[PDB]
Structure 1
């Protein structure tokens, strides 16, 4: 049977400069629109009607301060389809109401699905095991938990991260002041995976480059390698002795070493995603009850835990009126928490 389906399959899987595949029908439009939406919005679109903020090059923002901001809190969790009941097919209103945010987030979500299908698709054609696709589940878990689950637990899309450099920094600081997110053990595991991953990256790369076999005569050692050679290009035996004597333990199995390099950052990102799922419901690691009981009764008891809550309290009171304009917070000077003099 060589019908139209099989002929299409042939064409989609041609060896060209940019492989396409069946996955490409999903991947390429959604990735292109998410990126084009971010560039369009950060270049031309305001956040005046949703946040009270300028947010485009057109308005005078720079690369650090442009964003595609979330919709107004009054939109709830509306899909904000261009043809939906809020914008009603009006492209200009849609932009002013935050429609580009759901546009980027939803096309991005489906773009990510498409990229992971691409990893599966190419792996199956070339004949390799699909561990690259499996590792990519971690970025997907992060994207889905932070940009979709988290706001879906909260009051509206407004509290999702906005797509911009400084907007993401505000997101970090909001999470410290309101969620005490540094205290959360699921974030701590994520930090360990990310920093442990960076560590493994540096130490593996440096170890290989400094246990190389002399396989050529030049002082630039890059040339003395051939992709089809059968021999290891560096000495696992010498690498093992060096690290055993420097650090006490060392890898001896090169397959385990490289699985571990997959395992560590991937597991870390997955743990951080679980904690953010908790924060969707405000299910925080905010306090230690035993510390609070002692500190309430004993005004001489002070720890770095109680010091940090005072900082969180400052963050909340000083940023909430501007950061949450739909709430209409009016905090007179006299109610603002402040230490002496400052």
Structure 2
């Protein structure tokens, strides 16, 4: 029995409190350093110039911020897309002045979530189950990559990525609306439909299952105590739930193969989020949503406003104000 073997075995063991696996060798150190740097920076990071115009923005708790206003400000616009690790700066203070911690945290977080997907698959393989949970987890990973990496790549600067904070997230969303018209993009519509449908189906499935629960408890005891871990029979009556659902809407319209029902539950939000991440990715290369500006014209030629023109008005209001000092020329290219 060699040493390598022994190791490989401990690593791929399924009796450890938390599964390590080979993807864990990438997930654990990377996520740990990302979270350590994030926690330190959220508390004591000095201000950073983000637009590269020597106007630093404070985002740390010790610099007069609260939980909502605080954020990890993305790297400077002067750097752009350039790689900026610690050792390329002449001093740590300068590294902090140009927003290096944002790059560090975001790159490590992306590697960590990819390794997290891999580790999910690896444990699925070890336990002898069907290996497609990480496919479902791919959708949030794709969304995070689009918002943190793909959009800066398309725009050409890391300063365009989503800042790690609440108010920073809202600022990113508003500027995205102004410069890109996300709402009128069919992929954002698909994503909103997917999220609303996911909530709808979650609530309805939970209500239907809990409503039809076999009576195996008193009244002075939590209904949840009727079920025992490791049961052999279904604690709920599918027949009653399907009868209620069919009578509610229609007989034909109803799922019976609970397997098909759960597959649909998995399918709806996942495809919605995939389509949304594709909206963000496509719009990172300036393929914006529909522009129905001045589409309606009367006989003479005068323009009649629609509801889209008021959206354009709000977009103009946001646009002429964002990054007030950064621009020097009429067009935002």
Per the normalisation by structure 1, the TM-score is 0.89
Match of 2:144 in 1: 143
In the TM superposition, what is the alpha-carbon distance from 1:328 to its structure 2 partner?
5.3
Which residue of 2 is the match for residue 216 of structure 1? 217
Q: CA RMSD in A?
A: 2.0
- Quote the residue 1:64 is aligned against: 68
Using the TM superposition, name which of 254-263 and 217-226 deviates more: 217-226
Cα displacement (A) at 1:300:
5.3
Partner of 2:23: 23
The equivalent of 1:75 in structure 2 is 79
Whether the 8 Å CA contact 1:295–1:302 is kept in 2: the answer is no
Name the SS for the 1:136 alignment partner.
helix
Q: Which residue of 289, 294, 298 corresponds with 2:297? A: 294
Per-residue deviation, 1:131: 2.0
- Which stretch shows the higher mean deviation, 298-307 or 310-319? 298-307
Assess, with a 3 A threshold, how the Cα gap between structure 1 residues 327 and 240 changes in structure 2: closer, same or farther.
Answer: same
Deviation of 1:296 after TM superposition, in Å, equals 12
1:239 aligns with 2:238: no
The whole-number CA distance in structure 2 between the counterparts of 1:296 and 1:103 is 59
Q: How far apart in 1 are the matches of 2:84 and 2:298? A: 47
* Alignment CA distance shift 1:171-1:195 (3 Å): same
Which residue number in structure 2 is paired with residue 4 of structure 1? Answer: 3
- In structure 2, the partner of 1:340 is none
Residue 205 of structure 1 and its aligned partner are, at CA, apart by: 1.1
Alignment coverage as a number of residue pairs: 322
Shift of 1:27: 0.7
Match of 2:129 in 1: 128
Deviation at 1:297, TM superposition (A): 7.0
**Structure 1 residue 66 displacement after superposition:** 0.9
- Whether the 8 Å CA contact 2:296–2:303 is kept in 1: the answer is no
The answer to whether 1:155 aligns with 2:156 is: yes
CA shift, 1:7, in A, is 0.9
Q: Give the stretch that moved more between structures: 220-229 or 260-269.
A: 220-229
The structure carrying a bigger helix percent of its residues is 1
TM superposition shift of 1:38: 1.7
Aligned-pair CA distance for 1:34: 1.5
* Shift of residue 288, structure 1, vs aligned partner: 2.7
CA distance in 1: counterparts of 2:255 and 2:207, whole angstroms: 14
Mapped partners of 2:217, 2:5: distance in 1: 49
CA distance in 1, matches of 2:46, 2:170: 19
Confirm or deny: 8 A CA contact 1:135 1:266 kept in the other structure: yes
The aligned counterpart of 2:184 is: 183
Cα 1:297–1:312 shift into 2, 3 Å? farther
What's the secondary structure of 2:232's corresponding residue? Answer: coil
Q: Residue 243 of structure 1: CA displacement?
A: 0.9
Shift, 1:286, TM fit = 4.2
Aligned match of 1:39 = 39
Answer yes or no: is the 8 Å Cα contact 1:67–1:163 preserved in 2. Answer: yes
